Amino acid sequence: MKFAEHLSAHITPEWRKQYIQYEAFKDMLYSAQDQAPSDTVKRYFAKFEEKFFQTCEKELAKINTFYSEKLAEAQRRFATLQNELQSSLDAQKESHEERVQHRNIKDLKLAFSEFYLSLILLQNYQNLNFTGFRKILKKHDKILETSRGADWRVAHVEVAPFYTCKKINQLISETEAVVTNELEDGDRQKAMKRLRVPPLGAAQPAPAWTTFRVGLFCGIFIVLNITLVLAAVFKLETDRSIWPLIRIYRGGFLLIEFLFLLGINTYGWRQAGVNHVLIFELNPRSNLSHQHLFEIAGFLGILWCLSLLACFFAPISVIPTYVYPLALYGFMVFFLINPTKTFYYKSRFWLLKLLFRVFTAPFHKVGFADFWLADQLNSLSVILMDLEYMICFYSLELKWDESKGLLPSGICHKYTYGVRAIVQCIPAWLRFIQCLRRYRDTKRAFPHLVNAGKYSTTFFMVTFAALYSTHKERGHSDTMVFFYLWIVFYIISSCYTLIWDLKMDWGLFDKNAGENTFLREEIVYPQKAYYYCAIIEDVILRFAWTIQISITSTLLPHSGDIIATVFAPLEVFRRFVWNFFRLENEHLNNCGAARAVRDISVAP
Amino acid sequence: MKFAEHLSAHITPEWRKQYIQYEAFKDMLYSAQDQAPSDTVKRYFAKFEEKFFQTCEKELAKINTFYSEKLAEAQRRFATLQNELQSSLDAQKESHEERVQHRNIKDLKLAFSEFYLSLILLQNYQNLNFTGFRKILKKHDKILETSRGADWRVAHVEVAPFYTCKKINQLISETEAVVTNELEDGDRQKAMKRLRVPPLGAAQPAPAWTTFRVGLFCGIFIVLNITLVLAAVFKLETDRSIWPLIRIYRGGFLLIEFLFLLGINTYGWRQAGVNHVLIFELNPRSNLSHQHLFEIAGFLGILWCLSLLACFFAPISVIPTYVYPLALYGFMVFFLINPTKTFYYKSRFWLLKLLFRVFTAPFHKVGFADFWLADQLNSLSVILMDLEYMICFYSLELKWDESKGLLPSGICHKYTYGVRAIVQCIPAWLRFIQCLRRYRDTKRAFPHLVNAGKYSTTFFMVTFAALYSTHKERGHSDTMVFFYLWIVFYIISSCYTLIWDLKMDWGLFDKNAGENTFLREEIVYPQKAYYYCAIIEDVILRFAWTIQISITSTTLLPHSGDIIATVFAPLEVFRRFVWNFFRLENEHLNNCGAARAVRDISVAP
């Protein structure tokens, strides 16, 4: 009985402007209703109804025009796939060929599945637009105490082509018949199981077992944290240090914070209307939810706390303390490379495939998902540097003869060899090479080659930073020279990233901006406070991340160690607030070509 | 798409036998389908269709007959309330009177709300019976590759009165119009808000915030429980005892186990179809779920663990250890008597009202809810005895001069005065007096006066136990005499309760047991293993609860008796839990015979 909310959750976000304006009409009715000349009123509503029915005529015209355009495109795509399949069967029947033709079959199958989803989306369009007309017209007659709404509906909407046409139904039946008599080789149970569209978007809930587990893992994590504070304030001794430890376990804290903050992004994208399932090309009918990410965050959270607490205590006296941390990372590695069909095997298979393509950048094309991860792995380098220290620490600074040799020179945590500089230039190198590939593939030097410059600036800042320090460590006479050259590149990079991420990424500061001062014309998120507040945060922390990478090759005192351990967490909160406005921008480009399905092509 | 599961969740459990048999029909179609005599098959399906369409004719006849009966009752109830309201308005307009007439208005309002719910239930009946006919007939034509199903539907079900009648709609509109023009004094927004029926039964879910909180409270409690074991094995000392402690905190463990096991009952009753909302008379459109009980169990669980862990440790050195336990029970008491409109205020208001009526038994009538609680409070007496010891302990054995005087003679935990006997005969006395009232009100000595006998037997067993233990305590020559008289009453009670609850409560061992040997003719729960297994448990633990009330009279001098009591109080709870299933089920099978899916609300003259 709450249609407003029903339509607000059952609308294709890309076509949000082709759907009847229910709330505006309600405002109109309750406006003319709350305000009246209480002959004066007789002529007053003789003018309000004119406007009301006038607006209704325009809205019905829009739905009929939008409906006609989509049906034409549907007939075209149908003819397109029909020929490809006929040609494919003609080629296979007329005929390395098997493997390519196998994909050819797989390509044709994804094409017909994607086409069916589009026909269902168009059917649900007409169904929810007719329900809105009837429910609002009843509110009009019920508010104006008249019978004109009934007259209007029976003579206009009830005859409207958007509500009278009967070709989408035939097209849907034609496709399912072809998919069953051509691809499935005769099985409607398999064909329908493939072409059937379940509830999608923000109109489908999650299992209560997922909500329960999510909450359970969280509650254990909260208690195992208060314990680590007290135990860290009592059982620990001052005779030994806590830095080799803070160094290895700091990495795990960042990865868990990433998965937790990433689930809060999936939630905001879903409730705002940003179709991240089309931007990242994820199965439209089978995809994970914010709850599944919150669940994996809690699981690895408890695993981390128990390992560190077993290090503060001595649960076992036959087990060397330098095995708890090794088992934790060994476990996390297996949970991601499990060759069994369990624990989100399909979701993990996607991540394992993407990572490979993003670590072989120059040999593969770049899609939003591929480049987006490399920008995610460009804010998760502290994890790579922590892993770096751990490897050398257990190889050069670890006394296995001493069972308690895990927690006690520093060459493993220093860029004495540049290992903490080249490793710091791994994620930037991936994005630099991925950009050049895009340029070669697009033949456009803007923005493919201008952006490849934003990634190079880091190489210089990291290099000069490591050189000035080493020369100064040898007391050479090139200490101030490198120091000045270094600080120069630092400020250059800090601004070549802030501008490109507040202009070429978010897309704010638009010539076409009316009331949203310094903001794009159309903003998806609800409040304008979010955009203005995030702009301040990106600036404040864009000049505090170039310093956290220049202290990887400089801060002799443990003071610099505190700085690094206090910044790695804040950098994560920057990629988190930057994951909102980046995806939103990409969505506002699909809401212009009205693209609610992907464009799947077949192989010749 | 899954109609079978849509029917079995959207069916009024009382009328479950008036609804089309969808699964049987599917079995028939897929049976004749899996078994094809591959002329032979031409005549084979010429005989299968005959049977299939024959069964369809009978089912449609049943739905039309059941539908006709309910509509007649609806017209009568409508005329009944109509006259009462007319008379009520005529009396008020024609006229202590204000407060009785206020109730009179409230009585008329609940009557029209309950009537509306009945009309909606009857509308949903016709709607789900026509959907089943169409969905099965399509499966028949789709399985037999014929068009007979379509012909059958258009010429029979499409014309059937259960699908053609249009009077329920008029009745529903008539009632809402009367409730708005008579009671609300003109406001359809208030009238509809009162007479509107939301999703009810096993077809409505719970908020994910409830599932999350439930899980969160559980996780903290589990960790706080592993911490009590390790702390109880390290920080604790042997110089002092742990019995005054086990005595006070044992009571809280039982109450939390009750609320947790009770939520698992609400779950089983809802998924089996036992309408506990009609048996207990709870708002049909606003009632708590198993999740809300699991949530309160976890909350009080953490509160208990933290209090006992603060006693093993010394979180504060200015706070005497004998205040953690006092704050816990003080808090639980407030959470139940909160005068604010928060934390289930409505649900708590019902429990507070029922408890009062069940503690003033002789002055009020007895309903399933009232008598059922007194039987719930008859298995929660260890909590009363623990509360008893604690009070005397903090009054006669507590050294406040010693800040650490909470954990260290025993006269507070002994029946030296009979306090552990009269207190042990409080819940049985309530049930005894409630039964006699029923007899006076029913004038029937069976089963009202035979039942009052099962409750008296306890009075004797506890008494003689004390006589033998107290005479023996003064080494009198009447030690063996009382001991023999005592053991006699013990076995008498152990069997006068097992039989009554195996034949007069559960209702098993029926002349009409058929395939269900030693079980009633119709069993609601899915497996027959549950009934047989529970019978064994009620016996094994019906002869182990009479002993846990005979060790409350200076009998087991050694701490072994203390161990016995602390190990039985938990098992007794698991008996009332397995007895809460078959008792409510029995009451339901009595409503599934008169087809009563709404309560009968009367008005005041």
Ligand SMILES: CCCCCCCCCCCCCCCCCC(=O)OC[C@H](COP(=O)(O)OCCN)OC(=O)CCCCCCCCCCCCCCCCC
């Ligand atoms: C999922 C639900 C929740 C799971 C919870 C898991 C258990 C957590 C238990 C935490 C208990 C800590 C606080 C203990 C309070 C009471 C005891 C106390 O205060 O004394 C400290 C106690 C005894 O000390 P002591 O006798 O000196 O120990 C000798 C060991 N050689 O010290 C002890 O001996 C207590 C040792 C507790 C160790 C708990 C941490 C995990 C232990 C096993 C290793 C698991 C992690 C493995 C990591 C691999 C990588 C993932």
Ligand SMILES: CCCCCCCCCCCCCCCCCC(=O)OC[C@H](COP(=O)(O)OCCN)OC(=O)CCCCCCCCCCCCCCCCC
């Ligand atoms: C190699 C080391 C590099 C250093 C960093 C550590 C490794 C990377 C850590 C982050 C991993 C990626 C997390 C986010 C990726 C997903 C992004 C997204 O929004 O996509 C969601 C989507 C779920 O829907 P999906 O099932 O994929 O739908 C189509 C399926 N065909 O797809 C997904 O959800 C895909 C992701 C699967 C579910 C989450 C996986 C959690 C485990 C990640 C590995 C953690 C351990 C790394 C190694 C040890 C490090 C100490």
Ligand SMILES: CCCCCCCCCCCCCCCCCC(=O)OC[C@H](COP(=O)(O)OCCN)OC(=O)CCCCCCCCCCCCCCCCC
């Ligand atoms: C809801 C989410 C979860 C909530 C968790 C709440 C906190 C739980 C913390 C449990 C910690 C116990 C184990 C501690 C492990 C590390 C320290 C250790 O092993 O040593 C014991 C430690 C120090 O002992 P010590 O220094 O002798 O104390 C002096 C006091 N005069 O001993 C201590 O000093 C530790 C004391 C811990 C006390 C925790 C229990 C609650 C304390 C406040 C009272 C709350 C309950 C109030 C009850 C009222 C009725 C409801």
Ligand SMILES: CCCCCCCCCCCCCCCCCC(=O)OC[C@H](COP(=O)(O)OCCN)OC(=O)CCCCCCCCCCCCCCCCC
């Ligand atoms: C006086 C002391 C005697 C010794 C024992 C302790 C007190 C009694 C403990 C048990 C309390 C009753 C628990 C079960 C009662 C409910 C039974 C049931 O299935 O009914 C469910 C129903 C919920 O639906 P409802 O909202 O009532 O629908 C109509 C509303 N008009 O109605 C309800 O849910 C009603 C119950 C409200 C919700 C649960 C209340 C939990 C708190 C109970 C008190 C606990 C503390 C007692 C005092 C301290 C003891 C240490």
Ligand SMILES: O=P(O)(O)O[C@H]1[C@H](OP(=O)(O)O)[C@@H](OP(=O)(O)O)[C@H](OP(=O)(O)O)[C@@H](OP(=O)(O)O)[C@H]1OP(=O)(O)O
């Ligand atoms: O009963 P429904 O068919 O579901 O219709 C209801 C109902 O309208 P009707 O009484 O005309 O049926 C509500 O009105 P009241 O019953 O409370 O008088 C109305 O609320 P409004 O009067 O405020 O419009 C509500 O709509 P909503 O909940 O959005 O306010 C609307 O449900 P629909 O929106 O689905 O028509």
Ligand SMILES: O=P(O)(O)O[C@H]1[C@H](OP(=O)(O)O)[C@@H](OP(=O)(O)O)[C@H](OP(=O)(O)O)[C@@H](OP(=O)(O)O)[C@H]1OP(=O)(O)O
């Ligand atoms: O698509 P629907 O209208 O929701 O109907 C489906 C569908 O039947 P139709 O194809 O005739 O529509 C299923 O059959 P397939 O598509 O898989 O061939 C059928 O399953 P069965 O063939 O096994 O009967 C299923 O019913 P169910 O899920 O109970 O098996 C039934 O949905 P309904 O039960 O709601 O008619």
Ligand SMILES: CC(C)CCC[C@@H](C)[C@H]1CC[C@H]2[C@@H]3CC=C4C[C@@H](OC(=O)CCC(=O)O)CC[C@]4(C)[C@H]3CC[C@]12C
């Ligand atoms: C000051 C020195 C050391 C470094 C200079 C690099 C960056 C700090 C700044 C300087 C000028 C900026 C550029 C000025 C103008 C433009 C064009 C502007 O064009 C668009 O809006 C393109 C939109 C589209 O392609 O969709 C995008 C941002 C960009 C490249 C800016 C990106 C960031 C730049 C390169």
Ligand SMILES: CC(C)CCC[C@@H](C)[C@H]1CC[C@H]2[C@@H]3CC=C4C[C@@H](OC(=O)CCC(=O)O)CC[C@]4(C)[C@H]3CC[C@]12C
């Ligand atoms: C064993 C000695 C020490 C005590 C005797 C009392 C109980 C142990 C037993 C003896 C005979 C039993 C009765 C034998 C037969 C019946 C009739 C039987 O009839 C019904 O089914 C009544 C149903 C109804 O009234 O609704 C119900 C149980 C009852 C009363 C039994 C209840 C339990 C009784 C009283």
Ligand SMILES: CCCCCCCCCCCCC/C=C\[C@@H](O)[C@H](COP(=O)(O)O)NC(=O)CCCCCCC
């Ligand atoms: C490293 C730590 C691991 C912890 C490991 C646990 C991570 C989750 C912590 C709590 C937040 C998620 C669970 C909270 C509530 C969810 O049930 C709802 C479901 O949607 P609904 O409210 O519309 O039914 N989710 C939300 O409301 C949105 C997400 C809430 C985010 C809260 C931000 C703090």
Ligand SMILES: CCCCCCCCCCCCC/C=C\[C@@H](O)[C@H](COP(=O)(O)O)NC(=O)CCCCCCC
């Ligand atoms: C004193 C202790 C306090 C603990 C305090 C926590 C008490 C709850 C413990 C766990 C059981 C309840 C929560 C488990 C799952 C629920 O989400 C589902 C919801 O129904 P669904 O599965 O159909 O979606 N409930 C059930 O499946 C039925 C109840 C499960 C009972 C489990 C018995 C152990």
Ligand SMILES: CC(C)CCC[C@@H](C)[C@H]1CC[C@H]2[C@@H]3CC=C4C[C@@H](O)CC[C@]4(C)[C@H]3CC[C@]12C
């Ligand atoms: C200087 C500091 C305080 C700036 C803080 C900026 C943070 C708090 C702002 C910037 C962007 C904001 C987010 C922008 C978008 C959404 C999606 C919306 O559906 C929920 C709120 C949420 C999730 C906002 C949360 C608060 C937010 C993260």
Ligand SMILES: CC(C)CCC[C@@H](C)[C@H]1CC[C@H]2[C@@H]3CC=C4C[C@@H](O)CC[C@]4(C)[C@H]3CC[C@]12C
């Ligand atoms: C001797 C001992 C082992 C006997 C144990 C008896 C117990 C375990 C049996 C007896 C009655 C049984 C219950 C009977 C009814 C239901 C409702 C059903 O929907 C879920 C199972 C459930 C909840 C059963 C659980 C197991 C049960 C509690």
Ligand SMILES: CCCCCCCCCCCCCCCC(=O)O
């Ligand atoms: C750097 C530390 C990060 C962890 C601390 C929390 C950071 C994320 C906070 C998100 C706040 C906004 C959440 C919106 C939720 C909602 O709208 O329901």
Ligand SMILES: CCCCCCCCCCCCCCCC(=O)O
């Ligand atoms: C005496 C201790 C009692 C507590 C231990 C658990 C007792 C209840 C066990 C219930 C088991 C059956 C639960 C059925 C759940 C389901 O069917 O989904």
